[PDB]
Design an enzyme around this catalytic site. Structure first.
Site, mmCIF file in Angstrom:
data_model
loop_
_atom_site.group_PDB
_atom_site.id
_atom_site.type_symbol
_atom_site.label_atom_id
_atom_site.label_comp_id
_atom_site.label_asym_id
_atom_site.label_seq_id
_atom_site.Cartn_x
_atom_site.Cartn_y
_atom_site.Cartn_z
ATOM 1 C CG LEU A 145 7.675 10.226 -51.610
ATOM 2 C CD1 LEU A 145 6.748 9.039 -52.042
ATOM 3 C CD2 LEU A 145 7.041 11.062 -50.357
ATOM 4 C CG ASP A 146 12.422 6.961 -45.816
ATOM 5 O OD1 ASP A 146 13.646 7.088 -46.023
ATOM 6 O OD2 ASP A 146 12.212 6.043 -44.843
#
Ligand SMILES: NC(=O)C1=CN([C@@H]2O[C@H](COP(=O)(O)OP(=O)(O)OC[C@H]3O[C@@H](n4cnc5c(N)ncnc54)[C@H](OP(=O)(O)O)[C@@H]3O)[C@@H](O)[C@H]2O)C=CC1
Ligand code: SF4
Ligand code: SF4
Lengths: 103, 112, 61, 207, 76, 178, 325, 205, 109, 115
Positions: free
Chosen positions: E36-37
């Site tokens: 994830l970012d």
């Protein structure tokens, strides 16, 4: 019906006159000032002419100045007619508009 | 007693001389806290002293206004209050100090 | 009727060199009063404005 | 004297020079230059940090009641380091006089909003931000004012194309007014009307 | 009820679609593991706020990198 | 010099007659009846409206209307591809391409005015050195399509031929002022 | 450099075709018979001189020749869902297409694009479809390289499909043959069909072929109407009604002098199930990615709702069930 | 005036609507009638005269309550004063030329353009490239009918203006609309808009 | 010199707060303006626009971007920006041109 | 009967006008046309939101005054009585009571609209 807050949104008649004027000569840019305030055309262009004359260091002749003042006053009468008799129209008085637009 | 000032929202004062003396004295007192060489201090003291001397000399309000050359005595009182507030702000701004920073090389060169 | 309009001051046939009546060439750059590149009495930008006079034509409308 | 030349008076010029020295010596911390033009127009160029102090002084001081903010403008000079020159034109009714105050800003160096001093700036600063991209600190409601609602760009910048990048038309397929890249039947003509000969020797920049 | 907290957290993490359900685990760093970012983790925190009816400041939220950290925070 | 448009006059002028006059004004609507009387007066005046289609308003020799290109009395066209018109047009409505004619003459091969782009200002006709491009007295040239408002050289020449008498009369009347 | 004559521009699909041609920048010729007022919406679809409106009459072949004079492409969208007092299905789908095709061949148009229908068959129960098959044959006889396009049902803002079904609310309950089941519908999007036609106006491989423009999904009529009524948050009261009674109701509605709400042929075509692709190229051959009905149904159906449900999200309606027949 | 000045309905519909104090007007940047209806004695024709305005006599109307009614009276009186100025202009019109006799700035008469080489060259260049303006910057303001109309013009020495900012008097007025509308109804706002006297050509530019 | 954020970390905090605000507002925007898109599409567009500026490294430039994004957010929160103005973020009228050298050679230069 | 007939005829005339108005013109329907009006820009909120009333007190006063009219309307028959003294006393008392109520509201600033 009480107004708690006013937010005027303008720009719906912003055509970019100031940026356009940069691409014209002074004479070519004169007519833009008739269109700026379309009810006091000669007053607007007189203001522009006085500015350009200030920068050029020249003086218009006396007859020209008197003509300019005469038509500035005619234009002021025109504009005050428009203002008074459209304020009256918006309030609800219609007939002053018709009486004065003949003049 | 003036029934009205000519200006909307500006009420007529019944104690113009007393109010003017109060405000000018306050301005002088606050200026006492400025550095001695502050040109603002010097010039504002000049102006306030001149106006206070005029107020002291002239009892009649009309002739006092004529002397003060500031319109109505109410306008002169307003300007005195403005000057006092400006002195308070300047005492913190400290503009007498040396130029904060010079411009770039040709920041004010025109025609370019 | 037909018009015959006049001529301006500079329609002379002599003593009318343009260098004398040139206006644009007399414009000079602004005077630098103070610059960061290089008791007195308090003063105002101009003498205080004179108070206006109530009109004689019709002071009250 | 000369019918076609503007008549000039020195009383106004001397008064403006005196008042310029007056302001310069009253605010040494901000004033960087002072000049009176041959048109008789006092012009005080300040550091951008002194905008609020300078305007507060020029409005409140008794010997300078420049209480009307006639104009707030920005001029774009791309070459110089600080692109934008912010110009305040002020009017003093007590002394029937006009002054001009100038400062500078860059695309990433905001200026302090003077809405506290003059409320007239509330919209002039918004226009400056919209048309040049100069940001103002402590502005009650800074946002676009003249340009379209979703408009991207700052038109009055000299690097902005005259006709922009986008135009509107009605698309029946989607039943809306759609924004598309600009295509013109006839392109703008930029006539080159600059002569090789200098007209004014008095403004000859040294080689 | 820490077990219920951890069950709701896993439910929301699985209802989120970017992650991989099988690889999603109570010990799986959003950035390093799942992938994830920053913005993805912001949406994860907003989903947790939705589920628990509870707000989260950004200062506190930037650290909730794993579901165990999320449930420990919810323990509050 | 200044005058007060609305200044308080007095706040103590009390006599029975004044009080009763004010009461009568309030209860009898005196100023309202005065306004009604003014409108009634206007009803009985000759209306200023004109029967427009069959009765048109005045127009000066300087009226700036639809453009036209003129010819010399010998039938030659005055246009000599100056492009001063094109250079001065503030709205850039003029577009000119010229070639050296078979005669060896300087003449235009195309001369287009975008009448939807022109601001009808007259700079072209005042910058034209040979009185070639003019603004005739026509003010009734609306169309049902946009393209009809893109005038070309043939359209402008036909307009000039059509209005030559009136254009020539206007120039004759006004040229001494120019 | 395309000059395209669109013979059915003043319609549901013609406006999209003209719009896409104008966007491509090709000159367009619109032959119209309606009132000048009915073409104002096309008036603004092209820059100056791009569009040329000319009056025409199907009877007069001089008008057809004039329309197809200087055209490289001729698109024929002529059609009608009811038999007019002067024009019937045979005329509309055979005589006029044949006359247009022959005039185009004589003039020398490079491309001719004829639009038929997916279920156009010689044995179809529907008069319109049976006439369309004969029209295909005659067009391909008189213009042997003519392209044939066979759209399924087309749905859009001005359609007679989703609007037609949503209009059943005025009759309380929805009568269906076999209660909708035993009827498969594959509706295509009007924008997709228009893009396909415009692309076929230049695709080198398209000449002489027959395309079948069909949507991505196939629904049973019951599930499709259920989805439509779910989108237009209305009460769905379906009930079965045998085809002969349905055709009688259509006969009744088809007696209006104006545009009938429904007709015998309309109900027949509503209830005849769509066929399967079966080796025909399809939109993806011409490069149009078909758009599902789920995305574009809201823009068509939002105007049939009451205030309560006007501002409802696309995701508030359960998507239909798609068959795989 | 017989129709509107003394009408009780007009008086009720305009008096005490959108009252603005002198200090607030100055600080908001109002000009012209907006200032003068609040008691401020200002008028560029008198204080900073331009052209030949110093050679004509007129009176500047002044309001007392700073309301829509006072501004309406101010405008109605300004019309009469404009008639007063127009009479003096018609009577004092001097004889002479009409444009500065400087063919490097104003174009020469066509009769001369068609005869003299210098006049022809100057006409050609004036209508092609235009006259060059020496470098500088100016701000010029006039008492336009709507207020103080201003132009800040920056010339870079060429024949095309470098910058031209237009100070439209309505731009500052429309900003004070929120201030003036406080405690008023929608009809009162409609009344207030007219008194500001706004054409949006100048506001938007 | 700092416009607001001293460093990139503070600038990123401001950016993430802005992303939270836009993410929260998308559903209300769609519902109120009756857009023919889904909340998923709106939030995808918000992410795309945020990522379109992911290359910036200057805190001052990030501050300017955040200020202008906040302005757009206010404009959308309030219904000053209409549906025609909002659907311009989706460019559903553009036919993409190819990046293939041969395709560009065929069409134009 | 002569009244029911005329009222029904008026209702039928209005209904026929409505029917003609709706079933004669050619109709072209789409969402952009059928959307609500607001000076060319989309409404920012529903019109069903609360819309404050600044004369609520005067409305609830109007109710009582309307009932006062109810009490005053039988006067044409009342004056036909032999107890004219009693009828006059009652009418005067009622009217004066109404006047006192109006005056009390006026003084207490009930007739002034809320801000
Ligand atoms: N569901 C659909 O819409 C489907 C459509 N198609 C086909 O696509 C084509 C387009 O039909 P569509 O436009 O969608 O619906 P329309 O009914 O709007 O098409 C009608 C067009 O044909 C023209 N037309 C009809 N009769 C005549 C005539 N006698 N003489 C001249 N022109 C005439 C009309 O002009 P005017 O209206 O001005 O008279 C209009 O342009 C038809 O062939 C249709 O069968 C294919 C599959 C399904
Ligand atoms: S219009 Fe006049 S100026 Fe222009 S090319 Fe023709 S003759 Fe020359
Ligand atoms: S009248 Fe003015 S705008 Fe029109 S073509 Fe002539 S120069 Fe151009």
């Amino acid at each position: 019906e009480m107004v708690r807050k006013c937010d005027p949104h303008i720009g719906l008649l912003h055509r970019g006159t100031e940026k356009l004027i940069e691409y014209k000569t002074y004479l070519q840019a004169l007519p833009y000032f008739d269109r700026l305030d379309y009810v006091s055309m000669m007053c607007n262009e007189q203001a522009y002419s006085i500015a350009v004359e200030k920068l050029l260091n020249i003086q218009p002749p006396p007859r020209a100045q008197w003509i300019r003042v005469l038509f500035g006053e005619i234009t002021r009468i025109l504009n005050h007619i428009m203002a008074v008799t459209t304020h009256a129209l918006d309030i609800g008085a219609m007939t002053p508009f018709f009486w004065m637009f003949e003049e | 007693l003036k029934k009205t000032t000519g200006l909307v929202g500006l009420a007529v004062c019944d104690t113009p001389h007393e109010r003017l003396t109060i405000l000018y004295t306050k301005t002088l007192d606050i200026l006492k806290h400025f550095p001695k060489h502050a040109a603002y201090r010097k010039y504002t003291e000049q102006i306030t002293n001149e106006k206070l001397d005029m107020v002291k000399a002239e009892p009649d309000v009309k002739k006092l206004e004529a002397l003060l050359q500031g319109g109505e005595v109410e306008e002169v009182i307003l300007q005195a209050e403005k000057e006092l507030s400006l002195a308070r702000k300047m005492l913190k701004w400290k503009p007498w100090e040396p130029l904060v920073e010079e411009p770039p090389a040709n920041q004010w060169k025109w025609p370019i | 009727p037909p018009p015959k309009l006049p001529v301006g001051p500079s329609h002379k046939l002599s003593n009318n060199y343009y260098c004398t009546r040139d206006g644009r060439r007399e414009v000079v750059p602004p005077s630098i009063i103070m610059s960061s590149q290089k008791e007195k009495k308090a003063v105002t930008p101009a003498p205080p404005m004179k108070r206006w006079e109530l009109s004689k034509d019709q002071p009250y409308l | 004297k000369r019918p076609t030349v503007r008549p000039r008076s020195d009383v106004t010029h001397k008064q403006l020079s005196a008042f310029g020295e007056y302001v310069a010596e009253i605010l040494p911390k901000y004033v960087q230059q002072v000049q009176v033009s041959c048109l008789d127009e006092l012009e005080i160029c300040i550091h951008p940090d002194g905008v609020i102090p300078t305007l507060t002084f020029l409005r409140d001081h008794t010997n300078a009641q420049f209480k009307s903010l006639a104009d707030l403008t920005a001029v774009d000079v791309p070459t110089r380091q600080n692109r934008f020159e912010i110009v305040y034109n002020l009017l003093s009714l007590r002394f029937n006089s006009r002054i001009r105050v100038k400062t500078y800003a860059d695309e990433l160096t905001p200026i302090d909003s003077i809405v506290s001093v003059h409320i007239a700036a509330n919209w002039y600063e918004r226009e400056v931000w919209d048309m040049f991209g100069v940001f103002f600190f402590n502005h009650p409601d800074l946002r676009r004012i003249l340009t379209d609602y979703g408009f991207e760009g700052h038109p009055f910048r000299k690097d902005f194309p005259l006709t922009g990048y986008v135009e509107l038309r009605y698309d029946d397929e989607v039943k809306r007014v759609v924004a598309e890249p600009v295509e013109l039947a006839q392109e703008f003509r930029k006539f080159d009307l600059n002569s090789p000969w200098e007209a004014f020797p008095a403004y000859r920049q040294p080689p | 009820t820490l077990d219920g907290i951890k069950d709701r957290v896993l439910y929301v993490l699985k209802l989120y679609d970017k992650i991989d359900p099988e690889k999603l685990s109570v010990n799986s760093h959003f950035m390093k593991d799942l992938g994830l970012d920053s913005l993805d983790q912001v949406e994860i925190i907003m989903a947790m706020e939705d589920e628990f009816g509870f707000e989260i400041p950004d200062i506190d939220a930037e650290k909730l990198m794993c579901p165990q950290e999320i449930v420990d925070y919810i323990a509050d | 010099t200044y005058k007060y448009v609305n200044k308080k006059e007095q706040e103590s002028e009390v006599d029975m007659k004044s009080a009763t006059d004010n009461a009568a004004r309030i209860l009898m609507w005196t100023e309202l009846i005065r306004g009604l009387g003014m409108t009634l007066s206007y009803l009985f005046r000759e209306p200023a409206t004109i029967n427009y289609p069959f009765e048109k308003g005045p127009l000066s020799p300087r009226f700036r209307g639809e453009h036209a290109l003129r010819r010399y009395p010998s039938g030659e066209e005055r246009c000599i591809a100056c492009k001063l018109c094109e250079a001065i047009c503030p709205a850039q409505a003029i577009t000119i391409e010229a070639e050296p004619r078979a005669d060896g003459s300087r003449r235009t091969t195309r001369y287009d005015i975008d009448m939807t782009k022109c601001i009808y200002c007259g700079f072209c006709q005042e910058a034209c050195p040979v009185d070639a491009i003019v603004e005739g007295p026509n003010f009734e040239f609306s169309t049902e399509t946009h393209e009809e408002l893109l005038y070309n050289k043939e359209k402008l020449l036909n307009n000039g031929d059509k209005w030559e008498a009136e254009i020539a009369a206007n120039i004759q009347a006004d040229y001494l002022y120019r | 450099g395309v000059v395209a004559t669109v013979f059915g521009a003043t319609g549901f699909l013609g406006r999209y075709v003209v719009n896409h041609l104008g966007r491509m920048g090709s000159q367009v010729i619109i032959p119209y018979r309606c009132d000048v007022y009915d073409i104002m919406h096309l008036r603004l679809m092209g820059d100056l001189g791009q569009l040329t409106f000319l009056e025409w009459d199907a009877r007069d072949k001089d008008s057809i020749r004039k329309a197809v004079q200087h055209s490289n492409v001729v698109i024929n969208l002529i059609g009608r869902e009811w038999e007019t007092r002067n024009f019937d299905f045979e005329d509309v789908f055979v005589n006029i297409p044949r006359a247009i095709a022959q005039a185009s061949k004589e003039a020398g148009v490079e491309r001719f694009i004829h639009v038929s229908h997916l279920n156009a068959s010689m044995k179809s129960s529907s008069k319109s479809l049976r006439s369309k098959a004969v029209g295909e044959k005659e067009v391909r006889s008189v213009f042997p390289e003519a392209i044939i396009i066979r759209p399924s049902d087309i749905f859009g803002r001005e359609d007679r499909f989703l609007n037609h079904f949503a209009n059943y609310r005025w009759f309380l309950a929805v009568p269906l043959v076999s209660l909708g089941f035993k009827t498969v519908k594959q509706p295509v999007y009007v924008a997709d069909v228009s893009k396909g036609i415009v692309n076929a106006t230049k695709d080198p491989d398209a000449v002489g072929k027959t395309f079948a423009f069909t949507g991505p999904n196939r629904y049973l009529l019951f599930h499709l109407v259920k989805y439509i009524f779910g989108m237009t948050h209305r009460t769905f009261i379906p009930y079965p009604l045998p085809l002969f009674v349905y055709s009688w109701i259509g006969k009744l509605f088809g007696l209006s002098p104006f545009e009938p709400w429904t007709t015998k042929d309309k109900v027949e075509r509503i209830h005849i199930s769509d066929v399967m692709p079966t080796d025909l190229p399809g939109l993806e051959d011409l490069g149009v990615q078909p758009t599902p009905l789920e995305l574009k149904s809201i823009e068509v159906l939002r105007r049939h709702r009451t205030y309560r449900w006007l501002s409802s999200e696309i995701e508030e309606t359960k998507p239909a069930k798609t068959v795989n027949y | 005036e017989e129709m509107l000045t003394n009408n009780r309905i007009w008086r009720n519909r305009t008096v005490d609507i959108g009252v603005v104090t002198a200090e607030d007007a100055l600080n908001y940047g109002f000009s012209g009638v907006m200032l003068r209806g609040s008691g401020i004695q200002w008028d560029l024709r008198k204080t900073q005269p331009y052209d030949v305005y110093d050679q004509v006599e007129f009176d500047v109307p002044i309001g007392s309550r700073g309301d829509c009614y006072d501004r309406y009276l101010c405008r109605v009186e300004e019309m009469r004063q404009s008639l007063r100025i127009i009479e003096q202009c018609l009577n004092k019109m001097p004889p002479g030329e009409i444009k500065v006799d400087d063919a490097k700035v104003s174009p020469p008469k066509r009769a001369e353009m068609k005869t003299s080489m210098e006049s022809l060259i100057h006409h050609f260049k004036l209508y092609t490239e235009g006259y060059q303006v020496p470098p500088g910057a100016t701000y010029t303001a006039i008492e336009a009918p709507k207020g103080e109309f201003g132009v800040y013009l920056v010339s870079d020495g060429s024949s095309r203006p470098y910058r031209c900012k237009i100070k439209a008097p309505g731009f500052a007025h429309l900003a004070g609309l929120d201030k003036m509308s406080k405690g008023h109804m929608l009809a009162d706002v409609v009344a207030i808009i007219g008194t500001q006297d706004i054409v949006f050509g100048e506001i938007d530019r | 010199k700092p416009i607001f954020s001293r460093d990139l970390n503070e600038a990123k905090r401001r950016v993430r707060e802005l992303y939270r605000a836009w993410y929260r507002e998308v559903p209300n925007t769609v519902h109120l303006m009756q857009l023919d898109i889904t909340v998923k599409q709106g939030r995808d567009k918000v992410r795309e626009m945020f990522m379109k500026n992911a290359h910036v490294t200057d805190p001052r430039v990030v501050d300017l971007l955040v200020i202008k994004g906040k302005m757009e957010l206010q404009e959308t929160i309030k219904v000053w920006k209409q549906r025609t103005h909002v659907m311009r973020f989706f460019h559903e009228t553009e036919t993409p041109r190819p990046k293939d050298f041969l395709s560009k050679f065929y069409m134009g230069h | 009967m002569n009244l029911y007939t005329v009222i029904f005829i008026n209702i039928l005339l209005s209904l026929t006008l409505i029917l003609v108005a709706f079933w004669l013109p050619q109709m072209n329907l789409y969402s952009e046309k059928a959307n609500p009006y607001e000076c060319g820009f989309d409404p920012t909120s529903s019109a069903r939101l609360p819309f404050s009333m600044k004369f609520f007190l005067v409305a609830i006063t109007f109710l009582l005054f309307d009932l006062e009219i109810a009490l005053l309307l039988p006067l044409p028959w009342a004056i036909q009585t032999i107890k004219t003294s009693t009828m006059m006393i009652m009418a005067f008392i009622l009217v004066t009571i109404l006047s006192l109520g109006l005056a009390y509201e006026w003084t207490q600033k009930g007739l002034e609209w809320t801000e």
